[PDB]
Amino acid sequence: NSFDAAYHSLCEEVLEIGNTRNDRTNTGTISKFGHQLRFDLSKGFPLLTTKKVSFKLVATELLWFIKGDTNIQYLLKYNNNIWNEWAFENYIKSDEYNGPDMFNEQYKEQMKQFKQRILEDDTFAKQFGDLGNVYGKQWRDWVDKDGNHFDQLKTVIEQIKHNPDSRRHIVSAWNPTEIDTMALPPCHTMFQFYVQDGKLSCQLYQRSADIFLGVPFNIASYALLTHLIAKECGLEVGEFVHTFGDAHIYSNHIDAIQTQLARESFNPPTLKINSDKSIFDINYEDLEIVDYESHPAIKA
Amino acid sequence: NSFDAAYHSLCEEVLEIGNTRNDRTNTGTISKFGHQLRFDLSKGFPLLTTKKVSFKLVATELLWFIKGDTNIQYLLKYNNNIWNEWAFENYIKSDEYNGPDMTDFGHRALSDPEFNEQYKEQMKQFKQRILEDDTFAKQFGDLGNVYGKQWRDWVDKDGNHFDQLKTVIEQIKHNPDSRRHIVSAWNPTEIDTMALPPCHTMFQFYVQDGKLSCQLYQRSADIFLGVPFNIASYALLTHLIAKECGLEVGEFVHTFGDAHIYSNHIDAIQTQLARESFNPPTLKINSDKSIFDINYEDLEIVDYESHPAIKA
Ligand SMILES: O=c1ccn([C@H]2C[C@H](O)[C@@H](COP(=O)(O)O)O2)c(=O)[nH]1
Ligand SMILES: O=c1ccn([C@H]2C[C@H](O)[C@@H](COP(=O)(O)O)O2)c(=O)[nH]1
C-alpha cells in the first residue's frame, strides 16, 4: 500500500544514503537532510500497517491541541501518557512531592501515584496538570507585543472557507522569542493548506523527525488534521505532503526498522467522523477507524 | 547542468500536471502544491543559464537585508529598483512634492501616454534626488516591509530583541549537530496588516562533514519571475553563513507550497525550456571581513555564461 511504501522509501533512503552523526541526545543518528513524502488521503487514512500505530493516542492528542486545553487530565482520561514526564518534572520540584529525588523502581511507582491524583483530585489537576509549552497554544493562542491574542487556526478556517485560492494558508508553531526557554521546542514548525477541485491539502514542515518513533505518529496526526479542517470547511481531502529537515533514524533503531522493512502491508483503514458538530466540539468518540489491520508493535 | 535541470523539471512538471486556478491577483496560474528541489553547491553556483539572472540584483538585495538597512539609496547605487514603487507612492502624497498629481498611477501610466511621460519624468528626479541629496534620502528612502527585520530584530511583549540570524550563526559555531537551526520570517501577529506577507516563511541550516546546507520553505513561488532569483539568494545566503561559520557549502534544498507559473508566462517558459545549458559559474568571496561588513565589490562570479534575459 502507498502509505507504507512512502515510509518504507524514506526508511530505505536514510539507511542507504544517510550520514552518521552525533545528536543532542548522545545516541547517534543516521540522517538525511531534506526529504518529501506524499499521501493521497482519498486512498484512505495513512495509519501504518507494517507496525501498529495507535489511533487513540494520535486523535486524543490532536483534539487536545485543537480544543486549546493545556491540562493533562483530558489526556489521562483516555490513558494517553505521552506528556506525563513533562508535567511530572514540575510536580517533583514543589512543596507537594514527598517521595525520592528525580531507581527505575521508584520513579515508575511515583509516576503512578501522581497520575492517580490528577484524575481523582480536580483541583490538584488544575494545579500541576497544566503545562503550557505545547502546540495547542501556538495554534489557537499567540500573543503580540501589545498583549493581543491571535488565533491562527480560526483565521485559516475562515480564509480557507472564503478565500480558498489564497497561498497564505499558513499556521506557524515557531515563536523565535520563545525558543531558548523552551523545554523541547517544536518539531513541527509550520504547515500550509491548499485548495483545488473542492479538495483540501496540507503540507507540513518538520525540522526534525525520529523516523522510527515519531514520523508514523506525526503522519497520522497531520492526516487527521487535514480531515478535520476539511470537514469543517465542507471540503474533500486531497494530499498530505510531509516535508522533513533532519530525518533521522536513531542508532538504537536500525534493527527495529530492519524488522519493519521485511514486512508486507495490509490495506489501509478508512476514517469516519460521525457528527455535524463544529470540529472544536468534536470528541474522540466521534471518530472511527474502519478495518485497521497492522502487524504487531516493535520494541527498543 | 544539474541546476538548470532542476529548474526545468519544476516547470516541466507544473506545465503537465499543474492545475488551472485563479489567484489573488486575478491573473490565473497553473499550480502544483508541494515540491522539493536540490542544488549541490559544490558543483558551482546556481545562477540559471537558460536565462540570464542578475547576480547584482540578488546580492545587493540580500546584503541590504542582512545588514539591516531600511534605505533604498543603497539599492539605487547599484541600479536595484526592486523597491522603487513604494517609495514614490509615499513621496507623491507628501506636501513637498511639487509635480503633477501622481495619484494612483500605474494602471494610469499604462492608460495615459501623456501622463507616462510626466510619470517617468518624475520618477527620474525622485531617483536622482534620493542619490544626490542625503537629506532627501533620509526623509524618503526608508521603509519597514522587510525580511531583514524578522531575521535580525524580532521583538516580544517586554521589548527584548531577538536576532535570529546572529543567534544561529552562533549556534552553528557552537552546536553544529543541533536540529534546531531555524530562522523564521513569519510573524503571524503581523500578517493581517503588512504590505506583502513573506513568501520565504522560514529556513533551516544543517552541518554534516564540514558542510553547511540550507532548506527554504517557500509558501508561494512565481516559478518564472521569482524562483530564479530566489534560488540564487538562498544559495548566496548559504555561502555567506558558511563563511561566517568557518564551514564549506553543501546543498540548497528548496521546498514549495504553491509553485505556480502565472498564465502570461507560459510563452516565456516555453522559450526557456527549449534552450540548452552552459556549465554553471562559481562564486568567490574576496574578503576576510564579517559577512555583515562585506560589500558587493567583494563578491565575484566567475565564468557566468548564459542565454539572453527574457521578460513579461
Ligand atoms: O512529534 C515529534 C516530536 C519529536 N520528534 C523527535 C525528533 C528528534 O528525535 C527529537 C526532538 O529533538 P530535537 O530535534 O529537538 O533535538 O524528537 C519527532 O520525530 N516527532
Ligand atoms: O521572493 C519572491 C517574492 C514573491 N514571489 C511571488 C509569489 C507569488 O506569485 C507572489 C506573492 O503573492 P502571494 O503569494 O502573497 O499571493 O509573488 C516569489 O515567487 N518569490
PDB file of N, CA, C and O in Angstrom, chain B residues 18-66:
ATOM      1  N   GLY B  18       0.075  20.482 -13.396  1.00  0.00           N
ATOM      2  CA  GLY B  18      -0.345  21.603 -12.573  1.00  0.00           C
ATOM      3  C   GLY B  18      -1.802  21.829 -12.866  1.00  0.00           C
ATOM      4  O   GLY B  18      -2.310  21.347 -13.870  1.00  0.00           O
ATOM      5  N   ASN B  19      -2.480  22.553 -11.992  1.00  0.00           N
ATOM      6  CA  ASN B  19      -3.905  22.761 -12.170  1.00  0.00           C
ATOM      7  C   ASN B  19      -4.223  24.237 -12.409  1.00  0.00           C
ATOM      8  O   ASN B  19      -3.666  25.124 -11.770  1.00  0.00           O
ATOM      9  N   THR B  20      -5.084  24.477 -13.386  1.00  0.00           N
ATOM     10  CA  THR B  20      -5.639  25.793 -13.662  1.00  0.00           C
ATOM     11  C   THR B  20      -6.319  26.326 -12.420  1.00  0.00           C
ATOM     12  O   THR B  20      -7.206  25.687 -11.869  1.00  0.00           O
ATOM     13  N   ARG B  21      -5.920  27.499 -11.977  1.00  0.00           N
ATOM     14  CA  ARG B  21      -6.620  28.096 -10.871  1.00  0.00           C
ATOM     15  C   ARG B  21      -6.596  29.597 -10.984  1.00  0.00           C
ATOM     16  O   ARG B  21      -5.862  30.152 -11.797  1.00  0.00           O
ATOM     17  N   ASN B  22      -7.413  30.248 -10.167  1.00  0.00           N
ATOM     18  CA  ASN B  22      -7.427  31.706 -10.073  1.00  0.00           C
ATOM     19  C   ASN B  22      -6.601  32.111  -8.861  1.00  0.00           C
ATOM     20  O   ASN B  22      -6.445  31.335  -7.900  1.00  0.00           O
ATOM     21  N   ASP B  23      -6.036  33.309  -8.901  1.00  0.00           N
ATOM     22  CA  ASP B  23      -5.222  33.715  -7.789  1.00  0.00           C
ATOM     23  C   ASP B  23      -5.632  35.067  -7.299  1.00  0.00           C
ATOM     24  O   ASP B  23      -6.522  35.696  -7.873  1.00  0.00           O
ATOM     25  N   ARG B  24      -4.963  35.495  -6.228  1.00  0.00           N
ATOM     26  CA  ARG B  24      -5.216  36.776  -5.582  1.00  0.00           C
ATOM     27  C   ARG B  24      -5.107  37.964  -6.555  1.00  0.00           C
ATOM     28  O   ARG B  24      -5.834  38.938  -6.409  1.00  0.00           O
ATOM     29  N   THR B  25      -4.254  37.860  -7.571  1.00  0.00           N
ATOM     30  CA  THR B  25      -4.057  38.965  -8.492  1.00  0.00           C
ATOM     31  C   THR B  25      -5.017  38.938  -9.671  1.00  0.00           C
ATOM     32  O   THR B  25      -4.956  39.828 -10.528  1.00  0.00           O
ATOM     33  N   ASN B  26      -5.911  37.948  -9.718  1.00  0.00           N
ATOM     34  CA  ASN B  26      -6.797  37.717 -10.894  1.00  0.00           C
ATOM     35  C   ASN B  26      -6.006  37.579 -12.216  1.00  0.00           C
ATOM     36  O   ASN B  26      -6.397  38.135 -13.249  1.00  0.00           O
ATOM     37  N   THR B  27      -4.875  36.882 -12.179  1.00  0.00           N
ATOM     38  CA  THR B  27      -4.085  36.675 -13.380  1.00  0.00           C
ATOM     39  C   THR B  27      -4.305  35.265 -13.823  1.00  0.00           C
ATOM     40  O   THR B  27      -4.219  34.950 -14.990  1.00  0.00           O
ATOM     41  N   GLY B  28      -4.546  34.385 -12.871  1.00  0.00           N
ATOM     42  CA  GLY B  28      -4.636  32.982 -13.207  1.00  0.00           C
ATOM     43  C   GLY B  28      -3.246  32.380 -13.244  1.00  0.00           C
ATOM     44  O   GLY B  28      -2.277  32.992 -13.732  1.00  0.00           O
ATOM     45  N   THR B  29      -3.148  31.181 -12.680  1.00  0.00           N
ATOM     46  CA  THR B  29      -1.920  30.422 -12.725  1.00  0.00           C
ATOM     47  C   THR B  29      -2.251  28.968 -13.009  1.00  0.00           C
ATOM     48  O   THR B  29      -3.397  28.526 -12.844  1.00  0.00           O
ATOM     49  N   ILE B  30      -1.232  28.235 -13.432  1.00  0.00           N
ATOM     50  CA  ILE B  30      -1.206  26.796 -13.252  1.00  0.00           C
ATOM     51  C   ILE B  30      -0.208  26.451 -12.117  1.00  0.00           C
ATOM     52  O   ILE B  30       0.944  26.910 -12.099  1.00  0.00           O
ATOM     53  N   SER B  31      -0.697  25.663 -11.163  1.00  0.00           N
ATOM     54  CA  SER B  31      -0.076  25.476  -9.880  1.00  0.00           C
ATOM     55  C   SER B  31      -0.012  24.010  -9.456  1.00  0.00           C
ATOM     56  O   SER B  31      -0.971  23.240  -9.674  1.00  0.00           O
ATOM     57  N   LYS B  32       1.116  23.650  -8.840  1.00  0.00           N
ATOM     58  CA  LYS B  32       1.260  22.419  -8.060  1.00  0.00           C
ATOM     59  C   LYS B  32       1.448  22.787  -6.606  1.00  0.00           C
ATOM     60  O   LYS B  32       1.992  23.830  -6.279  1.00  0.00           O
ATOM     61  N   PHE B  33       0.997  21.943  -5.708  1.00  0.00           N
ATOM     62  CA  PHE B  33       1.218  22.238  -4.332  1.00  0.00           C
ATOM     63  C   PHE B  33       2.063  21.137  -3.748  1.00  0.00           C
ATOM     64  O   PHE B  33       1.603  19.988  -3.653  1.00  0.00           O
ATOM     65  N   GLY B  34       3.290  21.500  -3.356  1.00  0.00           N
ATOM     66  CA  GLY B  34       4.222  20.573  -2.748  1.00  0.00           C
ATOM     67  C   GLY B  34       5.280  20.140  -3.730  1.00  0.00           C
ATOM     68  O   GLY B  34       4.966  19.427  -4.708  1.00  0.00           O
ATOM     69  N   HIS B  35       6.531  20.557  -3.470  1.00  0.00           N
ATOM     70  CA  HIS B  35       7.670  20.216  -4.332  1.00  0.00           C
ATOM     71  C   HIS B  35       8.977  20.456  -3.639  1.00  0.00           C
ATOM     72  O   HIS B  35       9.071  21.264  -2.731  1.00  0.00           O
ATOM     73  N   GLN B  36      10.011  19.767  -4.089  1.00  0.00           N
ATOM     74  CA  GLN B  36      11.300  19.844  -3.444  1.00  0.00           C
ATOM     75  C   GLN B  36      12.371  19.674  -4.472  1.00  0.00           C
ATOM     76  O   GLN B  36      12.362  18.727  -5.251  1.00  0.00           O
ATOM     77  N   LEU B  37      13.288  20.627  -4.479  1.00  0.00           N
ATOM     78  CA  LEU B  37      14.361  20.678  -5.440  1.00  0.00           C
ATOM     79  C   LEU B  37      15.585  20.697  -4.609  1.00  0.00           C
ATOM     80  O   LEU B  37      15.550  21.258  -3.497  1.00  0.00           O
ATOM     81  N   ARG B  38      16.670  20.108  -5.135  1.00  0.00           N
ATOM     82  CA  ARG B  38      18.033  20.253  -4.544  1.00  0.00           C
ATOM     83  C   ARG B  38      19.031  20.874  -5.465  1.00  0.00           C
ATOM     84  O   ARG B  38      18.958  20.729  -6.669  1.00  0.00           O
ATOM     85  N   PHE B  39      20.003  21.535  -4.879  1.00  0.00           N
ATOM     86  CA  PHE B  39      21.090  22.137  -5.634  1.00  0.00           C
ATOM     87  C   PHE B  39      22.355  21.892  -4.875  1.00  0.00           C
ATOM     88  O   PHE B  39      22.519  22.403  -3.759  1.00  0.00           O
ATOM     89  N   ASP B  40      23.228  21.070  -5.453  1.00  0.00           N
ATOM     90  CA  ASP B  40      24.535  20.795  -4.877  1.00  0.00           C
ATOM     91  C   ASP B  40      25.449  21.998  -5.111  1.00  0.00           C
ATOM     92  O   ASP B  40      25.866  22.255  -6.241  1.00  0.00           O
ATOM     93  N   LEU B  41      25.775  22.740  -4.072  1.00  0.00           N
ATOM     94  CA  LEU B  41      26.618  23.932  -4.266  1.00  0.00           C
ATOM     95  C   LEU B  41      28.123  23.643  -4.485  1.00  0.00           C
ATOM     96  O   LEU B  41      28.917  24.537  -4.813  1.00  0.00           O
ATOM     97  N   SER B  42      28.540  22.403  -4.311  1.00  0.00           N
ATOM     98  CA  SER B  42      29.922  22.088  -4.605  1.00  0.00           C
ATOM     99  C   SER B  42      30.159  22.090  -6.116  1.00  0.00           C
ATOM    100  O   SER B  42      31.272  22.376  -6.579  1.00  0.00           O
ATOM    101  N   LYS B  43      29.112  21.776  -6.878  1.00  0.00           N
ATOM    102  CA  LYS B  43      29.180  21.760  -8.351  1.00  0.00           C
ATOM    103  C   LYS B  43      29.317  23.146  -8.977  1.00  0.00           C
ATOM    104  O   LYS B  43      29.540  23.250 -10.179  1.00  0.00           O
ATOM    105  N   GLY B  44      29.167  24.212  -8.191  1.00  0.00           N
ATOM    106  CA  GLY B  44      29.110  25.552  -8.764  1.00  0.00           C
ATOM    107  C   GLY B  44      28.010  26.354  -8.122  1.00  0.00           C
ATOM    108  O   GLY B  44      27.410  25.909  -7.143  1.00  0.00           O
ATOM    109  N   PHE B  45      27.755  27.541  -8.652  1.00  0.00           N
ATOM    110  CA  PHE B  45      26.781  28.435  -8.059  1.00  0.00           C
ATOM    111  C   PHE B  45      25.579  28.530  -8.991  1.00  0.00           C
ATOM    112  O   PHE B  45      25.736  28.794 -10.175  1.00  0.00           O
ATOM    113  N   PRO B  46      24.355  28.339  -8.452  1.00  0.00           N
ATOM    114  CA  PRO B  46      23.162  28.187  -9.293  1.00  0.00           C
ATOM    115  C   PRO B  46      22.541  29.516  -9.749  1.00  0.00           C
ATOM    116  O   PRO B  46      21.395  29.840  -9.365  1.00  0.00           O
ATOM    117  N   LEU B  47      23.264  30.275 -10.566  1.00  0.00           N
ATOM    118  CA  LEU B  47      22.582  31.275 -11.373  1.00  0.00           C
ATOM    119  C   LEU B  47      22.157  30.511 -12.591  1.00  0.00           C
ATOM    120  O   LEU B  47      22.974  29.861 -13.235  1.00  0.00           O
ATOM    121  N   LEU B  48      20.884  30.557 -12.900  1.00  0.00           N
ATOM    122  CA  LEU B  48      20.369  29.874 -14.071  1.00  0.00           C
ATOM    123  C   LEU B  48      21.174  30.224 -15.330  1.00  0.00           C
ATOM    124  O   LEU B  48      21.742  31.309 -15.411  1.00  0.00           O
ATOM    125  N   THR B  49      21.261  29.314 -16.305  1.00  0.00           N
ATOM    126  CA  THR B  49      21.992  29.652 -17.551  1.00  0.00           C
ATOM    127  C   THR B  49      21.109  29.610 -18.769  1.00  0.00           C
ATOM    128  O   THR B  49      21.526  30.003 -19.846  1.00  0.00           O
ATOM    129  N   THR B  50      19.897  29.110 -18.615  1.00  0.00           N
ATOM    130  CA  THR B  50      18.970  29.092 -19.742  1.00  0.00           C
ATOM    131  C   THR B  50      18.265  30.454 -19.867  1.00  0.00           C
ATOM    132  O   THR B  50      17.543  30.703 -20.827  1.00  0.00           O
ATOM    133  N   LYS B  51      18.529  31.328 -18.903  1.00  0.00           N
ATOM    134  CA  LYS B  51      18.038  32.701 -18.865  1.00  0.00           C
ATOM    135  C   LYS B  51      18.969  33.491 -17.931  1.00  0.00           C
ATOM    136  O   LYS B  51      19.286  33.033 -16.814  1.00  0.00           O
ATOM    137  N   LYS B  52      19.439  34.642 -18.396  1.00  0.00           N
ATOM    138  CA  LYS B  52      20.337  35.470 -17.588  1.00  0.00           C
ATOM    139  C   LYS B  52      19.662  35.941 -16.296  1.00  0.00           C
ATOM    140  O   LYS B  52      18.544  36.418 -16.319  1.00  0.00           O
ATOM    141  N   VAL B  53      20.355  35.795 -15.179  1.00  0.00           N
ATOM    142  CA  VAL B  53      19.862  36.248 -13.885  1.00  0.00           C
ATOM    143  C   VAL B  53      20.902  37.262 -13.415  1.00  0.00           C
ATOM    144  O   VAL B  53      22.098  37.051 -13.625  1.00  0.00           O
ATOM    145  N   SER B  54      20.451  38.356 -12.803  1.00  0.00           N
ATOM    146  CA  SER B  54      21.327  39.428 -12.407  1.00  0.00           C
ATOM    147  C   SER B  54      21.909  39.191 -11.022  1.00  0.00           C
ATOM    148  O   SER B  54      21.289  39.546  -9.989  1.00  0.00           O
ATOM    149  N   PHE B  55      23.111  38.628 -10.958  1.00  0.00           N
ATOM    150  CA  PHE B  55      23.778  38.496  -9.669  1.00  0.00           C
ATOM    151  C   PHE B  55      23.743  39.835  -8.908  1.00  0.00           C
ATOM    152  O   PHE B  55      23.398  39.883  -7.716  1.00  0.00           O
ATOM    153  N   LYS B  56      23.995  40.936  -9.614  1.00  0.00           N
ATOM    154  CA  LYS B  56      23.945  42.268  -8.980  1.00  0.00           C
ATOM    155  C   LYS B  56      22.656  42.506  -8.178  1.00  0.00           C
ATOM    156  O   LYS B  56      22.697  42.955  -7.032  1.00  0.00           O
ATOM    157  N   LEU B  57      21.511  42.180  -8.774  1.00  0.00           N
ATOM    158  CA  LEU B  57      20.233  42.461  -8.102  1.00  0.00           C
ATOM    159  C   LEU B  57      20.125  41.606  -6.851  1.00  0.00           C
ATOM    160  O   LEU B  57      19.929  42.152  -5.738  1.00  0.00           O
ATOM    161  N   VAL B  58      20.355  40.290  -7.046  1.00  0.00           N
ATOM    162  CA  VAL B  58      20.379  39.267  -5.983  1.00  0.00           C
ATOM    163  C   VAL B  58      21.228  39.655  -4.800  1.00  0.00           C
ATOM    164  O   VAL B  58      20.744  39.790  -3.673  1.00  0.00           O
ATOM    165  N   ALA B  59      22.511  39.821  -5.058  1.00  0.00           N
ATOM    166  CA  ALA B  59      23.454  40.007  -3.973  1.00  0.00           C
ATOM    167  C   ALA B  59      23.224  41.324  -3.288  1.00  0.00           C
ATOM    168  O   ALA B  59      23.317  41.415  -2.058  1.00  0.00           O
ATOM    169  N   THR B  60      22.911  42.363  -4.038  1.00  0.00           N
ATOM    170  CA  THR B  60      22.737  43.668  -3.355  1.00  0.00           C
ATOM    171  C   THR B  60      21.452  43.682  -2.531  1.00  0.00           C
ATOM    172  O   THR B  60      21.393  44.295  -1.501  1.00  0.00           O
ATOM    173  N   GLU B  61      20.417  42.997  -2.986  1.00  0.00           N
ATOM    174  CA  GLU B  61      19.231  42.925  -2.146  1.00  0.00           C
ATOM    175  C   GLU B  61      19.608  42.218  -0.828  1.00  0.00           C
ATOM    176  O   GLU B  61      19.350  42.740   0.275  1.00  0.00           O
ATOM    177  N   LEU B  62      20.244  41.050  -0.969  1.00  0.00           N
ATOM    178  CA  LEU B  62      20.482  40.189   0.136  1.00  0.00           C
ATOM    179  C   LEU B  62      21.362  40.914   1.152  1.00  0.00           C
ATOM    180  O   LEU B  62      21.043  40.900   2.348  1.00  0.00           O
ATOM    181  N   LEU B  63      22.476  41.519   0.705  1.00  0.00           N
ATOM    182  CA  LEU B  63      23.390  42.190   1.648  1.00  0.00           C
ATOM    183  C   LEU B  63      22.652  43.297   2.432  1.00  0.00           C
ATOM    184  O   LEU B  63      22.839  43.488   3.650  1.00  0.00           O
ATOM    185  N   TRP B  64      21.790  43.988   1.706  1.00  0.00           N
ATOM    186  CA  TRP B  64      20.944  45.003   2.250  1.00  0.00           C
ATOM    187  C   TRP B  64      20.028  44.460   3.333  1.00  0.00           C
ATOM    188  O   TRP B  64      19.926  45.112   4.407  1.00  0.00           O
ATOM    189  N   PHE B  65      19.356  43.317   3.066  1.00  0.00           N
ATOM    190  CA  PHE B  65      18.512  42.636   4.075  1.00  0.00           C
ATOM    191  C   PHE B  65      19.398  42.317   5.267  1.00  0.00           C
ATOM    192  O   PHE B  65      19.101  42.734   6.385  1.00  0.00           O
ATOM    193  N   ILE B  66      20.464  41.537   5.051  1.00  0.00           N
ATOM    194  CA  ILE B  66      21.202  41.043   6.208  1.00  0.00           C
ATOM    195  C   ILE B  66      21.918  42.142   7.026  1.00  0.00           C
ATOM    196  O   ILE B  66      22.191  41.951   8.212  1.00  0.00           O
TER     197      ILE B  66
END
